[PDB]
Design a protein around this ligand. Structure first.
Ligand SMILES: OC[C@H]1O[C@@H](O)[C@H](O)[C@@H](O)[C@@H]1O[C@@H]1O[C@H](CO[C@H]2OC[C@@H](O)[C@H](O)[C@H]2O)[C@@H](O[C@@H]2O[C@H](CO)[C@@H](O[C@@H]3O[C@H](CO[C@H]4OC[C@@H](O)[C@H](O)[C@H]4O)[C@@H](O)[C@H](O)[C@H]3O)[C@H](O)[C@H]2O)[C@H](O)[C@H]1O
Length: 198
């Protein structure tokens, strides 16, 4: 594993702040919206990790995340996700996509408030096994079957966005915004050294 130091920012770069000397990338959500960072290379399998401290206060409406995707915006994509749902800061959702088909959501109870400090989130991606880990514990394991598996090379992505418009607000809640600016911290992001492609 190696630190990720070369990133790209896909929109609203003034809402993404990188402090290389502290190995910390910070995404802000406020009246300007949010932002999204990514690796500049794709990867073909490997282990991906980050310390994450989610935003303070009433995060209803917001989605903050870290995920692998073959290309954000593509509708036939492969993906592996961690997504925090802002109305409940004591859960995280995992999911994965195969050629544009998802619908494999699972909700996990964290046992902590995801904004209380840094916690470690890890995705291990292989051709027949994917694991999600939180603070060193496997929380989900999936194996390849006839129903598809993520195999395209993928970028590492993270964003904060207002998802309150999704499913009439049932997914992340209405956006209240009482505690803007919301700041999500990503520290010690680590990506595979030898399966980067590109
Ligand atoms: O949750 C992570 C991940 O989970 C998977 O399950 C899913 O497959 C992924 O798509 C999802 O990724 C995140 O998706 C959101 C929503 O966008 C997606 O669906 C809609 C489609 O339009 C997108 O292409 C998909 O990516 C995404 O958040 C949005 O990203 C947009 C950019 O692609 C943002 O639009 C941009 O906003 C800029 C800022 O200003 C505008 O928005 C804020 C307003 O205040 C302002 O008035 C607007 O002008 C614009 O400058 C820019 O032109 C515009 O393109 C959008 O705001 C944002 O919500 C996450 O980034 C992504 O990680």
């Amino acid at each position: 594993a190696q630190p990720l130091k070369f990133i790209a920012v896909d929109y609203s770069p003034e809402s993404c702040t990188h402090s290389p000397e502290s190995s910390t990338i910070t995404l802000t959500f406020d009246h300007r919206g949010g932002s999204r960072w990514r690796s500049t290379t794709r990867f073909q399998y490997g282990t991906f990790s980050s310390l994450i401290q989610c935003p303070k206060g009433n995060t209803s409406g917001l989605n903050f995340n870290i995920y692998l995707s073959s290309l954000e915006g593509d509708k036939s994509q492969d993906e592996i996700d961690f997504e925090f749902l802002g109305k409940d800061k004591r859960i995280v959702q995992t999911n994965y996509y195969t050629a544009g088909t998802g619908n494999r959501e699972a909700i996990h109870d964290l046992g902590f408030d995801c904004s209380d400090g840094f916690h470690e989130y890890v995705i291990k991606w292989g051709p027949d096994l994917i694991q999600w880990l939180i603070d060193g514990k496997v929380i989900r394991s999936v194996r390849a079957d006839g129903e598809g598996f993520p195999q395209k090379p993928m970028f590492l992505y993270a964003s904060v966005w207002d998802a309150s418009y999704i499913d009439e607000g049932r997914w992340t809640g209405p956006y209240v915004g009482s505690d803007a600016p919301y700041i999500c911290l990503y520290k010690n992001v680590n990506v595979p050294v030898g399966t980067a492609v590109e």
